[PDB]
Ligand binder design. Structure first.
Ligand SMILES: *[C@@H]1O[C@H](CO)[C@@H](O[C@@H]2O[C@H](CO)[C@@H](O)[C@H](O)[C@H]2NC(C)=O)[C@H](O)[C@H]1NC(C)=O
Ligand SMILES: *[C@@H]1O[C@H](CO)[C@@H](O[C@@H]2O[C@H](CO)[C@@H](O)[C@H](O)[C@H]2NC(C)=O)[C@H](O)[C@H]1NC(C)=O
Ligand SMILES: *[C@@H]1O[C@H](CO)[C@@H](O[C@@H]2O[C@H](CO)[C@@H](O)[C@H](O)[C@H]2NC(C)=O)[C@H](O)[C@H]1NC(C)=O
Ligand SMILES: *[C@@H]1O[C@H](CO)[C@@H](O[C@@H]2O[C@H](CO)[C@@H](O)[C@H](O)[C@H]2NC(C)=O)[C@H](O)[C@H]1NC(C)=O
Ligand SMILES: *[C@@H]1O[C@H](CO)[C@@H](O[C@@H]2O[C@H](CO)[C@@H](O)[C@H](O)[C@H]2NC(C)=O)[C@H](O)[C@H]1NC(C)=O
Ligand SMILES: *[C@@H]1O[C@H](CO)[C@@H](O[C@@H]2O[C@H](CO)[C@@H](O)[C@H](O)[C@H]2NC(C)=O)[C@H](O)[C@H]1NC(C)=O
Ligand code: NAG
Ligand code: NAG
Ligand code: NAG
Ligand code: NAG
Ligand code: NAG
Ligand code: NAG
Ligand code: NAG
Lengths: 245, 415, 227, 196
C-alpha cells in the first residue's frame, strides 16, 4: 500500500523493438518462434483467432510439448509427447463459425502432464468492429515452473499496440519441469470453403522479456499504477536513484 | 557597478526603509533510543548469549544515545527559556500604530500560537525493531508560550526586561531610543512615526504572504528531520542483509541448521548488525554536535538581537538592527529582524574643517556639506541640514594644518 | 547509593499468550487481539493479531510494510485477511529521589499503556505508564524530567492535613512566574536605586591527555601476537 | 560542568579496560592461556578473534574521544573569547558577561577550567511617572538629548533612562528641530533659558 517498490527481474522493457506476427485479410502465418528466457505475447483479435500455444523443445517424439486450447469450452492443458505435424492450425469455419476438427498432433504418446480445464460457452467466429480485445500473456521459467501472467485490455487498436499502462495477474504456476526452447502460436483459420482457407482482421505480437530493474508503483489498493524502466533513459536511471517519479 | 572616489564629495542618504527579514535556525533533533538485543538478536534465546561475550558494547552504545537526548533538551532550554517572568499578551495589539497582531498569539483562536508560528508549523511536513523516539520535554505549546512571552515583553518593556527588572515604556519612545542607537536622531521618528508604522505593517504582511505560499524557505528545519529519518531508515534496511550467511532471519538459521555451525552463522549476523549500530551511533553523535553549535548560535542571537539592540554588523540582519522577534517552529526558532535601510542618496560637497577667523572648526556628531548655497552640518545617516554654530562644532588649532579647509563663517548665537 | 534522577534500569517486553498454527501438525486456528505466536503457512511471528482493513488482491496473501515488514496475512486453512502489528516493548526507567533522602521509587514504562503493565496508583502519560507517582494539579519548576511537559519530585502530597508522606508527585511543568506589567501610553518606569551583583560562570577548558598504546592493549606483550 | 567531563573521561577509560577481559568467540579471554592450551596453527584462529575485538573497542574509544575533544575545544574557544571581551574590556553584548550591565570580570582558575566572576549593575526600586515625547515651548518642539521627559507632580524634569537624577530643563539639554504640530504627543511647558 502506497509504496514505490524497486525490483530487478525479467520484464519487458519500456518501448522495446517488438515483432509483429500478422494473421489478417488473406494471409495466415503459423511459424515457430524462439522462446528466449520468457516471452510477452499480445493477442489482439475480435474473432477469438488465437486460442493457445505450443511450447516444446526438440519436436522428435522425445520432447515434452505443452499445448493449451482456449477455444470456447474445449480447454485442456495437455503437456504431451507426439509427432509435431506441420500446420496444426485451429479451423473455425467462415460464415458458419464452427470449429472444424484438425489434428493438433499426429498422436499422443507420453502426456507427462494432463489437466482438464473447465468448459465455458464462448464465441469462436468472425465478429464486427475493431479487434478491441487485447489478451496479454507473459511466460517465465523458474525451476521447472512456467509462470503465466495474463491481462485483458478493451483499449482500441487502430494501427497496432496502443500506448498506455496496465498490469497482468499471475494466474498459473505450472510445474512442467521441461527445457522448452520453442513457442508456436495456435491460430484459427476461416475457410470460405474446404481447401481455400482465410483469416480474420486480427493480429498477434511477440516480444522478448529482458532482465532489468523496475520501480513498480504499488498504490493503496495494491495495484501497480505506474512504473519506470531504469535502463531506458538517463533520467529513468535518476528516477530509480531518487525513487520519486 | 561604478563608484567614483572623489576627494571632495560625499553621499548622504535622504530617505529610508524598515525591512523585516527571516532567519531560520535548527535548535533540537529528535531523541531516539535503541536496545541492542531486540535489534540484533531479534528475540532469540540462543543469541544474546553470544552477545555477552562481546562485553559492554551495549551499555556504551545506549549511553551515547541517552547523552544526545539530554543535550537536545538542554539546547531547547538554553534557547527559549531566557525569559524569567511570563508576561501576558496585551489585550490591545496596536502599539503607537505598529501592528503586532501577527506576531502575538490571538486570544480568539484555539491554536494558542501566532499566525506566523501557525504557518511555520503548517509548512514543515513531518513500532519497529528496538527503536523508540522519546517525547521532547517541552511541548510545542510550551515553547509557544515562551515565545509569546518574549514578544509581549519586548513590545511592552523594550530592551529593559532582558537585563534586570522589567520596566514598561510607550512603544513610541522605545522605537525612538532604538533609532537613536543606530545614529538617526529622535526627531526623525517623532516626525515620521506614521510612515514608519506603515512600512512596519507592510513588512510583516509581506513576510506573512511569503510564508503563506508554497515557498520552501524552511529547508534548514527539514534537513535535520530528513537526514535523521534517512539514518533511522537505513538501519532497519540492514536487518534484511545476510552478511555472508545463509539467511538474514536469525530464527531461519536457527531452525534450518544444527546448533554448532548455526553458531558460526549467528556470529556472522551479530558482527554485521553490531557494525551497523556502531555506524549509526557515530553519525548521530556528529549530527548532535552540529545541532548543538547551531543551538548555541541561536541562543546567542536570542540573547543579543531580541533582549537588546545588537550593534554587531550583519549579525542579526542585513542593515542597522532595530528589534528582533523570535518565533517557534518544528525543532527550531525563526528570528524576524527589523533593520533600518538607508536609501535615496544625494551627491554633496564636503570639507574636513572650516576656517572662520584664523581657527579651524571641526564637526562633532555630523559632517560638513554644501547644499549649493551655504555650508551646513548634518548627521551621516540621514539628511537634516543644520546651520553651523559654535555648539555644533568645536574649535582646535590654526587653519594651515588641515588639508581641504574651506572658508566659511561660524555663527555664534549668543552674541 | 543513588542520586536523584530517572535512570533507565532495564527493558520491558510483553510475552505472547497463546500459540496458534494453521496449514493449507494440526491447527489451532485463531486468537485475536492478544500477543500471539502466529504460524500461518509455515511463517512464525510473535505479534498481536487483528482483522485487516484494506482489500487484498485475490492472489495476494501477505501485506507488506514500507520497511518490508509483514503487517497482514491470509489464513491458509480458513479464509480471512488479518492485520499484523507488533506487541508492546518499552524500556523501564526508575525515578528515585536521592537514596539519602528516601528509598521510595517510582517506575516509568516508557511507551506502554497502563493496561499492559503487570504501585497503588498508576498515571497514564504521553511518555509511558508512571507507577508510584501521585499526580497533583499544582505546578512547580521541573525537578526530574519525565517528558511531555511533566516532571516528578519529592513533595508533601497533603493526604490528611500533610501526613508527611512526601510521596513522589508528577506535575505538569511551570514555565516561570507570572508578572503583571501593563502597557500605558504616557507612563515610564525609572529605577531609583541599584545593586552590584556578582555571578560565577564555569567553563571547561581541557580534558585529561590520555595515551593508549595499541600493542599493549591488543596483544598484551605476546610475541606470537601482533603478527 | 567540570566534574562531568572528568566523569565521562573516567567512564570511557574504565569501559575500555573492562572490555579487555572478554572472549570474542575465543575459548579464553587471556592471551597467555590460549597460547598455553593451543598449538600456533590453531592458536592463531582464536588470537585473530581477540585482535578483532580489541581493535574494534579501541576504535570506538578513539572515535568517541575525538568528538568529545571537539566539544571541549569549542568550550575553550568560547572561554578565550569571554576572557578577551569581558576581562580585558567592557562588553556591550547582552548576557555575554554576567546578567544585567557588565562592569568588570575577574578570572579564577579551576581544575581543567576557568571560572568568571562577572560584576553587573542591576537597576532596582523603580518609580513610575508620567512622561512626554517632547515639549512645545514657544512654537517650537524641544526634544530631549540623552534622557527622558518626566513629570514628578510640580514641574517637568529630564533624567537619564536608568537612574533618577531630576534636573531642570534648559536649552542645554534640548534641541529644537521643528514645530509643535507634527509630534503626536506634544506637551506644553517652558524651557528655561540660562542666558536670559
Ligand atoms: C521615502 O520613501 C517612502 C516609501 O515610498 C515614501 O512614502 C511614500 O510616499 C508617497 C508620497 O508621499 C506615498 O504615495 C506612498 O504611499 C508612501 N509609501 C510609504 C510606504 O510610505 C516617503 O514619502 C519617502 N520620503 C522621502 C523624503 O523621500
Ligand atoms: C492589525 O493587522 C491585522 C491583520 O491584518 C488586521 O486584521 C485584519 O483586518 C482586515 C480589515 O479590518 C481584515 O480584512 C483581515 O481579515 C484581518 N486579519 C486578521 C488576521 O484578523 C487588524 O485590523 C490590524 N489592526 C490594527 C490596529 O492595525
Ligand atoms: C540651500 O540652503 C539655503 C540656505 O538654507 C536654502 O535657502 C533657504 O531655504 C529655506 C527653505 O525654504 C528658506 O526658509 C530660507 O529662507 C532660505 N534662505 C535663503 C537665504 O534663501 C536653499 O533653498 C538651499 N538650496 C538647495 C538647493 O539645497
Ligand atoms: C580664507 O580667507 C583668508 C583671509 O581672507 C585667506 O588668507 C589670505 O587671503 C588672501 C586673499 O586676498 C591671500 O592672498 C593670502 O595668500 C591668504 N593668506 C595669508 C594672507 O596668509 C585665505 O587664503 C582664504 N582661504 C581660501 C581657501 O580662500
Ligand atoms: C517635585 O519636584 C520639586 C522640585 O524638586 C519638589 O519641590 C521641592 O521640594 C523640596 C522638598 O519639599 C523643597 O525643599 C523645595 O524647595 C521644593 N522646590 C521648590 C522650587 O520649592 C516637589 O516636592 C516634588 N514633588 C513630588 C511629588 O515629588
Ligand atoms: C499649548 O498651548 C498653546 C497656546 O496656548 C495651545 O495652542 C492653542 O490651541 C487651541 C486648540 O487648537 C487653539 O484654539 C488656540 O488658538 C491655540 N493657541 C495658539 C496661541 O496657538 C495648544 O493647544 C497647547 N497644547 C496643549 C497640548 O494643551
Ligand atoms: C480502490 O478501489 C475502490 C473501489 O473501486 C476505489 O473507490 C478507490 O479509489 C481505489 N483506490 C485506488 C488507490 O485505486
Ligand atoms: C552624482 O552622482 C551620480 C550617481 O549618483 C554620479 O554619476 C555623478 O558623477 C555625481 N556627480 C557629482 C558632481 O557628484
Ligand atoms: C583632489 O584631487 C584633485 C586631482 O588631483 C586635486 O587637483 C585637488 O587639489 C585635490 N583636493 C584635495 C582637497 O585633496
Ligand atoms: C545526607 O543528607 C544529610 C542531611 O541533608 C547530610 O547530613 C548527609 O551528609 C547526607 N549524606 C551524604 C552522603 O551526602
Ligand atoms: C491507551 O488506551 C486508551 C484507551 O484504551 C487508548 O485510547 C489509547 O490509544 C491507548 N494508547 C496507545 C498508545 O495506543
Ligand atoms: C506604575 O508602573 C508600575 C510598574 O509596572 C505598576 O506596577 C504601577 O501600577 C504603575 N502605576 C500606575 C499605573 O499608576
Ligand atoms: C495614547 O495617547 C493619546 C494622547 O497622545 C491618548 O489620547 C490615548 O488615550 C492614549 N492611549 C490609550 C490607550 O490611552
Amino acid at each position: 500500500s502506497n509504496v514505490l517498490h524497486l525490483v530487478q527481474d525479467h520484464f519487458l522493457p519500456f518501448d522495446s523493438n517488438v515483432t509483429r506476427f500478422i494473421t489478417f485479410g488473406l494471409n495466415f502465418d503459423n511459424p515457430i518462434i524462439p522462446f528466449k528466457d520468457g516471452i510477452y505475447f499480445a493477442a489482439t483479435e475480435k474473432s477469438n483467432v488465437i486460442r493457445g500455444w505450443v511450447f516444446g523443445s526438440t519436436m522428435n517424439n522425445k520432447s515434452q510439448s505443452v499445448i493449451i486450447m482456449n477455444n470456447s469450452t474445449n480447454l485442456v492443458i495437455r503437456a504431451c509427447n507426439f509427432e509435431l505435424c506441420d500446420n496444426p492450425f485451429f479451423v473455425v469455419l467462415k460464415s458458419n463459425n464452427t470449429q472444424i476438427p484438425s489434428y493438433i498432433f499426429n498422436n499422443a504418446f507420453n502426456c507427462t502432464f494432463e489437466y482438464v480445464s473447465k468448459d465455458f460457452n464462448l464465441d469462436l467466429g468472425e465478429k464486427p468492429g475493431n479487434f478491441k480485445d487485447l489478451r496479454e500473456f507473459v511466460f517465465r521459467n523458474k525451476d521447472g515452473f512456467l509462470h503465466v501472467y495474463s491481462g485483458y485490455q478493451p483499449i482500441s487498436a487502430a494501427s497496432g499496440l496502443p500506448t498506455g499502462f496496465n498490469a497482468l495477474k499471475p494466474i498459473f504456476k505450472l510445474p512442467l519441469g521441461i527445457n522448452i526452447t520453442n513457442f508456436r502460436t495456435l491460430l484459427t483459420a476461416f475457410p470460405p470453403r474446404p481447401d481455400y482457407w482465410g483469416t480474420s482482421a486480427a493480429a498477434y505480437f511477440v516480444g522478448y522479456l529482458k532482465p532489468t530493474t523496475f520501480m513498480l508503483k504499488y498504490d493503496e489498493n495494491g495495484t501497480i499504477t505506474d512504473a519506470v524502466d531504469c535502463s531506458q533513459n538517463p533520467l529513468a536511471e535518476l528516477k530509480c536513484s531518487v525513487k520519486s517519479f | 557597478s561604478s563608484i567614483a572616489y572623489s576627494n571632495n564629495t560625499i553621499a548622504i542618504p535622504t530617505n529610508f526603509s524598515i525591512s523585516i527579514t527571516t532567519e531560520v535556525m535548527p535548535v533540537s533533533m529528535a531523541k531516539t533510543s535503541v536496545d541492542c538485543n531486540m535489534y540484533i538478536c531479534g528475540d532469540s534465546t540462543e543469541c544474546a548469549n553470544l552477545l555477552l561475550q562481546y562485553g559492554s558494547f551495549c551499555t556504551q552504545l545506549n549511553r551515547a544515545l541517552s547523552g544526545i537526548a539530554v543535550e537536545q533538551d538542554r539546547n531547547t532550554r538554553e534557547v527559549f527559556a531566557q525569559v524569567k517572568q511570563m508576561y501576558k499578551t496585551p489585550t490591545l495589539k496596536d502599539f503607537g500604530g505598529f501592528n503586532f497582531s501577527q506576531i502575538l498569539p490571538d486570544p480568539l483562536k484555539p491554536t494558542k500560537r501566532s499566525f506566523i508560528e501557525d504557518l511555520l508549523f503548517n509548512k514543515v511536513t513531518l513500532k519497529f525493531n528496538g527503536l523508540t523516539v522519546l517525547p521532547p520535554l517541552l511541548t510545542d505549546d510550551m515553547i509557544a508560550a515562551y515565545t509569546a512571552a518574549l514578544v509581549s515583553g519586548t513590545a511592552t518593556a523594550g530592551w529593559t526586561f532582558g537585563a534586570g527588572a522589567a520596566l514598561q515604556i510607550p512603544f513610541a519612545m522605545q522605537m525612538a531610543y532604538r533609532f537613536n542607537g543606530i545614529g538617526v536622531t529622535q526627531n526623525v521618528l517623532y516626525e515620521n512615526q506614521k510612515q514608519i508604522a506603515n512600512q512596519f505593517n507592510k513588512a510583516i504582511s509581506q513576510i506573512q504572504e511569503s510564508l503563506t505560499t508554497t515557498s520552501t524557505a524552511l529547508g534548514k528545519l527539514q534537513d535535520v528531520v530528513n537526514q535523521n529519518a534517512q539514518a533511522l531508515n537505513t538501519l532497519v534496511k540492514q536487518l534484511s542483509s545476510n552478511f555472508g550467511a545463509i539467511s538474514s532471519v536469525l530464527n531461519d538459521i536457527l531452525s534450518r541448521l544444527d546448533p554448532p555451525e548455526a553458531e558460526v552463522q549467528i556470529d556472522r549476523l551479530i558482527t554485521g548488525r553490531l557494525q551497523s549500530l556502531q555506524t549509526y551511533v557515530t553519525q548521530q553523535l556528529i549530527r548532535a554536535a552540529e545541532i548543538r553549535a547551531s543551538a548555541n548560535l541561536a541562543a546567542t542571537k536570542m540573547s543579543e538581537c531580541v533582549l537588546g539592540q545588537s550593534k554587531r554588523v550583519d549579525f542579526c540582519g542585513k542593515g542597522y538592527h532595530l528589534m528582533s522577534f523570535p518565533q517557534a517552529a518544528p525543532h527550531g526558532v525563526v528570528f524576524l529582524h527589523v533593520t533600518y535601510v538607508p536609501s535615496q542618496e544625494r551627491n554633496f560637497t564636503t570639507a574636513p574643517a572650516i576656517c572662520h577667523e584664523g581657527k579651524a572648526y571641526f564637526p562633532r556628531e555630523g559632517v560638513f556639506v554644501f547644499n549649493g548655497t551655504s555650508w551646513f552640518i548634518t548627521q551621516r545617516n540621514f539628511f537634516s541640514p543644520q546651520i553651523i554654530t559654535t555648539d555644533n562644532t568645536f574649535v582646535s588649532g590654526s587653519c594651515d594644518v588641515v588639508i581641504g579647509i574651506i572658508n566659511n563663517t561660524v555663527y555664534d548665537p549668543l552674541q | 547509593e543513588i542520586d536523584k534522577g530517572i535512570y533507565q534500569t532495564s527493558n520491558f517486553r510483553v510475552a505472547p499468550s497463546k500459540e496458534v498454527v494453521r496449514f493449507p501438525k494440526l491447527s489451532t486456528d485463531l486468537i485475536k487481539n492478544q500477543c500471539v505466536n502466529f504460524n500461518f503457512n509455515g511463517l512464525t511471528g510473535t505479534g498481536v493479531l487483528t482483522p485487516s482493513s484494506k482489500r487484498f488482491q485475490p492472489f495476494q496473501q501477505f501485506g507488506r510494510d514500507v520497511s518490508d515488514f509483514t503487517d497482514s496475512v491470509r489464513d491458509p486453512k480458513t479464509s480471512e485477511i488479518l492485520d499484523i502489528s507488533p506487541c508492546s516493548f518499552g524500556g523501564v526507567s526508575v525515578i528515585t529521589p536521592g537514596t539519602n533522602t528516601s528509598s521510595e521509587v517510582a517506575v516509568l514504562y516508557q511507551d506502554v499503556n497502563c493496561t499492559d503493565v503487570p504501585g497503588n496508583n498508576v498515571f497514564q502519560t504521553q511518555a509511558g505508564c508512571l507507577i508510584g507517582a501521585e499526580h497533583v494539579d499544582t505546578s512547580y519548576e521541573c525537578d526530574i524530567p519525565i517528558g511531555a511537559g511533566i516532571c516528578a519530585s519529592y513533595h508533601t502530597v497533603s493526604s490528611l492535613r500533610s501526613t508527611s508522606q512526601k510521596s513522589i508527585v508528577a506535575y505538569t511543568m511551570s514555565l516561570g512566574a507570572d508578572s503583571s506589567i501593563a502597557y500605558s501610553n504616557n507612563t515610564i518606569a525609572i529605577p531609583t536605586n541599584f545593586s552590584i551583583s556578582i555571578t560565577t560562570e564555569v567553563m571547561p577548558v581541557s580534558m585529561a591527555k590520555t595515551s593508549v598504546d595499541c600493542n599493549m592493549y591488543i596483544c598484551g606483550d605476546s610475541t606470537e601476537c601482533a603478527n
